[PDB]
Amino acid sequence: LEIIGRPQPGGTGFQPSASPVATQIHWLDGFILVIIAAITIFVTLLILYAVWRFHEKRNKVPARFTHNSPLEIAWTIVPIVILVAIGAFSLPVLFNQQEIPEADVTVKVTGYQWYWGYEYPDEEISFESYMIGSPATGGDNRMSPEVEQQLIEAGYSRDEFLLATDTAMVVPVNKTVVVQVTGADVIHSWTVPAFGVKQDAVPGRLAQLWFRAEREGIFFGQCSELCGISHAYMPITVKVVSEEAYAAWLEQHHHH
Amino acid sequence: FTRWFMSTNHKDIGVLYLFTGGLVGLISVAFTVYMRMELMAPGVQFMCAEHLESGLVKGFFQSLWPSAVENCTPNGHLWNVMITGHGILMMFFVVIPALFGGFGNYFMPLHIGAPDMAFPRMNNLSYWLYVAGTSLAVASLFAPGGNGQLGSGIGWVLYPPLSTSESGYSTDLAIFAVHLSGASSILGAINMITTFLNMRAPGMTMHKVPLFAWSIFVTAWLILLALPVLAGAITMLLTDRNFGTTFFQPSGGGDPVLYQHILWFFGHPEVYIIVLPAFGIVSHVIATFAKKPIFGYLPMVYAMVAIGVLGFVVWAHHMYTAGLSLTQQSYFMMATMVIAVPTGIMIFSWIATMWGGSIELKTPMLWALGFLFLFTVGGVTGIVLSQASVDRYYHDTYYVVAHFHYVMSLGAVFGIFAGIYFWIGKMSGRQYPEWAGKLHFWMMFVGANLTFFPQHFLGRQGMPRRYIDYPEAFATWNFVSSLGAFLSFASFLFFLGVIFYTLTRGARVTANNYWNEHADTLEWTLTSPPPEHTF
Numbered sequence: 001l002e003i004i005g006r007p008q009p010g011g012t013g014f015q016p017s018a019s020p021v022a023t024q025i026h027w028l029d030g031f032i033l034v035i036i037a038a039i040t041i042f043v044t045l046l047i048l049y050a051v052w053r054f055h056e057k058r059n060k061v062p063a064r065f066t067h068n069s070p071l072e073i074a075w076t077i078v079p080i081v082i083l084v085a086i087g088a089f090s091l092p093v094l095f096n097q098q099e100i101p102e103a104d105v106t107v108k109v110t111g112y113q114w115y116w117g118y119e120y121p122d123e124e125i126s127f128e129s130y131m132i133g134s135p136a137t138g139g140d141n142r143m144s145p146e147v148e149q150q151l152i153e154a155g156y157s158r159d160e161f162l163l164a165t166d167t168a169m170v171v172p173v174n175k176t177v178v179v180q181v182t183g184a185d186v187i188h189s190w191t192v193p194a195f196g197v198k199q200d201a202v203p204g205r206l207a208q209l210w211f212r213a214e215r216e217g218i219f220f221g222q223c224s225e226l227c228g229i230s231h232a233y234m235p236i237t238v239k240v241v242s243e244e245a246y247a248a249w250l251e252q253h254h255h256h
Numbered sequence: 257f258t259r260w261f262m263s264t265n266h267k268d269i270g271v272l273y274l275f276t277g278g279l280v281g282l283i284s285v286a287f288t289v290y291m292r293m294e295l296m297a298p299g300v301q302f303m304c305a306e307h308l309e310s311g312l313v314k315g316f317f318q319s320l321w322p323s324a325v326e327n328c329t330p331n332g333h334l335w336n337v338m339i340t341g342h343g344i345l346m347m348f349f350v351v352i353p354a355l356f357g358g359f360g361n362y363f364m365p366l367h368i369g370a371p372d373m374a375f376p377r378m379n380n381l382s383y384w385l386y387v388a389g390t391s392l393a394v395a396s397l398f399a400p401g402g403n404g405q406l407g408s409g410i411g412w413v414l415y416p417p418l419s420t421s422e423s424g425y426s427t428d429l430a431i432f433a434v435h436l437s438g439a440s441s442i443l444g445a446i447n448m449i450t451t452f453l454n455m456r457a458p459g460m461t462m463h464k465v466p467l468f469a470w471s472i473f474v475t476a477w478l479i480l481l482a483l484p485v486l487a488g489a490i491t492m493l494l495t496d497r498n499f500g501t502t503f504f505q506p507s508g509g510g511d512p513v514l515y516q517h518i519l520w521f522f523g524h525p526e527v528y529i530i531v532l533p534a535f536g537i538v539s540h541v542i543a544t545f546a547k548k549p550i551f552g553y554l555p556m557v558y559a560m561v562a563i564g565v566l567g568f569v570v571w572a573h574h575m576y577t578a579g580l581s582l583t584q585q586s587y588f589m590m591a592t593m594v595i596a597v598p599t600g601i602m603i604f605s606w607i608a609t610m611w612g613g614s615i616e617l618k619t620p621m622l623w624a625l626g627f628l629f630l631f632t633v634g635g636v637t638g639i640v641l642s643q644a645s646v647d648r649y650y651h652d653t654y655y656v657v658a659h660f661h662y663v664m665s666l667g668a669v670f671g672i673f674a675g676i677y678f679w680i681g682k683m684s685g686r687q688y689p690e691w692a693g694k695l696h697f698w699m700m701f702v703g704a705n706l707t708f709f710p711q712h713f714l715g716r717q718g719m720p721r722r723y724i725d726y727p728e729a730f731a732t733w734n735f736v737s738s739l740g741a742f743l744s745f746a747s748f749l750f751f752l753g754v755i756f757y758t759l760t761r762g763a764r765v766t767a768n769n770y771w772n773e774h775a776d777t778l779e780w781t782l783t784s785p786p787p788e789h790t791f
């Protein structure tokens with residue numbers, strides 16, 4: 001499988017999109033970015049022009065005006081228009097994001113100090129997922145020859161250190177996955193940038209997110225609510241695979 | 257002598273806040289240098305568990321020299337302690353004390369023609385509570401804390417159940433520190449409000465009050481509503497930890513998310529409390545150096561009131577991923593966007609003030625213009641983050657870190673430097689050397705942008721907040737960010753050199769108004785420094 005959802009050296013953009021929601025986020029952010037870069041370039045060019053044009057060496061006697069009603073009306077209404085425009089494209093995206101559709105696959109995720117537990121209630125599968133290199137796998141949260149070996153053995157390389165876990169959440173491509181997220185001890189946060197999802201894992205609450213992955217591959221997230229000493233060291237690996245490869249993985253877990 | 261510390265005169269207390277704010281600022285900035293040393297390269301090299309086995313002093317010095325990864329057992333607790341320490345000091349014991357306690361106490365009475373604050377003894381007490389709060393905050397770093405080590409590794413906002421389950425009593429000392437700070441702020445707001453309403457000079461009508469005095473007045477009201485709410489939030493943490501309550505503990509039927517609503521109800525207003533006095537200072541500086549009266553005085557006062565008011569109905573933009581319904585999310589998104597409007601009015605008014613002026617590019621004016629540019633950069637990313645759909649990706653990443661460092665460290669702090677250079681002659685009787693102020697400005701301008709702009713890239717690439725260590729791919733922009741921080745630190749040490757020089761051997765100030773006629777408020781009508789008893 002291809003490693004797709006990961007940061008890349010020197011990156012300045014988003015992680016690759018692998019869901020329709022991630023795609024929406026990229027577009028909305030791209031649209032807002034154009035607008036806000038235009039606003040700040042505008043503001044910056046005004047300041048630099050005014051400093052050049054009205055420098056004391058070039059404009060020796062200052063004006064005294066403190067009003068310009070047509071300008072103050074224009075500069076109050078135009079921001080309002082800009083915001084309403086953003087709001088118009090942004091609220092649909094938010095609605096699509098937060099309205100949970102019918103699940104093809106249901107995973108219940110629990111955050112612990114410091115690892116994730118997955119359960120597939122339809123399949124009676126559960127397992128825990130630890131960082132390769134955590135104490136669970138024999139390490140102490142740093143790179144070493146042993147940790148690199150384990151990364152290799154698991155199908156990764158030393159570059160995926162801090163991202164790769166011993167076990168992955170596996171799901172089928174082009175299916176609606178609904179994830180129910182909670183915390184066991186403190187608040188954690190479960191996320192996958194390539195899917196455009198993030199939901200806090202709060203003790204005593206069960207919250208939901210959805211994604212539908214549009215291509216196969218490996219996708220990484222990292223715990224996104226400070227939860228103590230190994231906050232930096234409890235990531236998320238999602239493998240998106242074919243329907244048959246998914247069933248194959250299910251059967252491997254079946255107790256006869 | 258200790259006759260400075262027992263003084264009740266608003267000018268002396270103003271000076272005490274400023275200096276103390278500056279010293280605590282130095283301590284917290286030193287933390288960020290250490291933080292950026294560790295973040296400079298992937299793998300943990302400085303914050304090694306091995307350094308714990310030494311003493312306090314020996315351990316400290318060892319931790320400043322990098323180890324090989326193979327000799328360094330990562331100590332996440334120390335990272336979390338430094339970050340929490342950095343954040344607490346800044347938000348409670350640095351910038352507000354300097355702007356509100358410092359320039360507010362010194363200059364607000366002068367601007368309204370008041371001889372002193374309504375309750376001078378209360379003003380002195382507010383200073384000592386600040387100092388007591390600071391001391392407890394620092395002591396918490398050396399107190400038994402989480403994971404059987406020293407200090408609280410819990411973030412400046414103290415989310416439960418993590419804050420409630422952190423072992424030792426370090427967290428309780430931190431909570432007491434915050435109580436003391438809130439108390440200091442509340443007394444200050446009492447004084448500012450009474451003085452402003454009752455002790456104005458004859459003829460000084462409301463529509464004749466200078467903008468800085470207005471910024472402090474508005475700020476003082478925000479404090480009176482915000483800080484009591486925070487005292488509630490944190491007392492509930494204290495009772496969950498010590499007195500068997502369970503407000504935030506699900507086993508006893510509590511909800512951790514309730515704490516978030518209460519905390520952020522204080523927490524947003526808090527940033528407008530930081531920035532409003534900086535808006536005041538920018539107004540006075542720009543008018544002076546543009547040699548032109550402030551454009552749209554009345555829209556400015558109203559925009560500040562509007563911002564103050566809206567700052568109380570937006571809090572849950574800090575909680576988009578915490579389990580808010582779609583309706584709450586939509587509301588808080590739209591209410592947050594509205595804040596861009598009055599703020600835009602002020603940015604454009606400041607530009608209109610410059611427009612058609614006669615511009616003198618002296619040091620205070622450079623800080624003020626940097627403020628306009630950088631606050632705009634921070635403000636528009638704030639607008640991005642208000643979009644819940646996009647905040648889904650950015651929340652708890654370095655994109656957020658970049659937002660707030662632009663509005664605060666390149667916004668509010670530029671306001672603080674603007675005021676120091678503007679007013680140091682007036683306060684001390686001595687003038688700063690002009691070439692040094694400009695050098696300070698350009699070093700800070702370049703360094704601070706190098707530090708924080710690349711954090712936008714880290715966030716977009718998905719780098720989480722509060723990490724001691726990070727995946728190798730984040731290496732490039734972390735390295736640049738760290739070089740920016742080392743340069744900014746250099747500019748701050750230089751600044752302290754400039755202040756030391758100015759105060760010991762700076763050129764004598766001889767004029768009442770050493771700027772120009774357009775510095776037109778009452779302080780420029782007095783001597784430099786003003787007489788012990790004014791008005």
Ligand code: HEA
Pocket residue numbers: 039043078079080082083413527528530531573574592593595596599600601603631632633634635636637638639641642643647650651652656659660663664667668
């Ligand atoms: C000085 C302090 C300060 C100030 C003034 C602001 C100002 C703003 N903040 Fe920021 N903020 C912080 C300090 C500050 N912030 C901190 C510390 C945090 C993180 C806390 C933590 O988690 O630790 C944070 C986090 C934060 C979040 C949460 C993000 C997350 O955690 O996921 C959000 C979400 O909406 C937000 C929004 C805004 C907005 C919309 C503004 C607005 O006030 C900005 C308005 C200004 C402008 C828009 C620029 C000028 C306007 C124009 C030039 C007009 C034209 C512009 C348009 C039409 C858009 N902020």
Ligand code: HEA
Pocket residue numbers: 274275277278281282285288289291292339340342343344346347350351354410411412413657661664665668669672704707720721722723724741744745747748
């Ligand atoms: C005013 C607020 C303020 C200021 C000025 C700063 C200044 C700096 N901060 Fe700060 N930062 C916070 C508030 C602030 N920070 C908060 C609230 C957090 C969140 C904590 C948490 O996660 O819980 C945070 C977190 C934070 C992080 C992320 C930590 C993490 O997620 O793990 C980083 C990373 O580099 C960082 C770095 C820096 C650097 C390099 C500087 C500086 O070195 C930049 C250079 C600036 C200067 C050199 C000038 C400083 C001047 C003053 C402070 C004024 C002094 C007063 C007088 C002179 C009167 N900070």
Ligand SMILES: CCCCCCCCCCO[C@@H]1O[C@H](CO)[C@@H](O[C@H]2O[C@H](CO)[C@@H](O)[C@H](O)[C@H]2O)[C@H](O)[C@H]1O
Pocket residue numbers: 046065066067068069075604607608611
């Ligand atoms: C959205 C971004 C906008 C950024 C703001 C920066 C631009 C500011 C432009 C100011 O415009 C000036 O306003 C004056 C006052 O309205 C006009 O003076 C006019 O009116 C004065 C007021 O009486 C007279 O004294 C003058 O003679 C007469 O020219 C003047 O022509 C005009 O150029």
Ligand SMILES: CCCCCCCCCCO[C@@H]1O[C@H](CO)[C@@H](O[C@H]2O[C@H](CO)[C@@H](O)[C@H](O)[C@H]2O)[C@H](O)[C@H]1O
Pocket residue numbers: 113114115134135136230
């Ligand atoms: C019929 C009676 C039945 C009796 C019960 C049997 C007792 C079994 C002991 C299980 O205790 C585990 O110990 C781990 C090792 O100490 C802990 O790991 C914790 O500490 C590790 C080491 O620091 C971290 O790396 C982990 O992430 C963190 O979860 C883990 O949480 C805890 O559950």
Ligand SMILES: CCCCCCCCCCO[C@@H]1O[C@H](CO)[C@@H](O[C@H]2O[C@H](CO)[C@@H](O)[C@H](O)[C@H]2O)[C@H](O)[C@H]1O
Pocket residue numbers: none
């Ligand atoms: C009548 C006889 C009773 C028989 C049943 C015994 C029940 C066991 C008590 C459970 O409490 C445990 O205490 C441990 C010790 O504090 C914790 O380990 C925690 O603390 C250790 C510190 O010593 C760390 O090493 C571990 O990583 C960390 O999980 C552990 O989580 C917690 O569940």
Ligand SMILES: CCCCCCCCCCCCC
Pocket residue numbers: 012013014036037040633636637712713
């Ligand atoms: C593919 C590259 C994406 C472009 C990255 C630039 C983002 C910078 C955000 C900061 C905007 C401040 C106005």
Ligand SMILES: CCCCCCCCCCCCC
Pocket residue numbers: 320321322
């Ligand atoms: C071969 C290792 C290179 C040594 C670099 C050590 C730099 C540490 C400087 C510490 C400065 C304290 C602020």
Ligand SMILES: CCCC[C@@H](O)[C@@H](O)CO
Pocket residue numbers: 122123124247248250251254
């Ligand atoms: C793909 C095979 C599915 C196996 C299924 O019968 C069991 O997992 C039921 O728990």
Ligand SMILES: [Ca+2]
Pocket residue numbers: 293294295296297298299300301302
């Ligand atoms: Ca490092």
Ligand SMILES: [Cu+2]
Pocket residue numbers: 188189223224225226227228230231232
């Ligand atoms: Cu975490």
Ligand SMILES: [Cu+2]
Pocket residue numbers: 523524570571573574
């Ligand atoms: Cu806010």
Ligand SMILES: [Cu+]
Pocket residue numbers: 111112113114187188189223224225226227230231234
């Ligand atoms: Cu976690």
Ligand SMILES: [Mg+2]
Pocket residue numbers: 189224225651652
């Ligand atoms: Mg969070």
Ligand SMILES: [O-]
Pocket residue numbers: 523524527
């Ligand atoms: O905020």
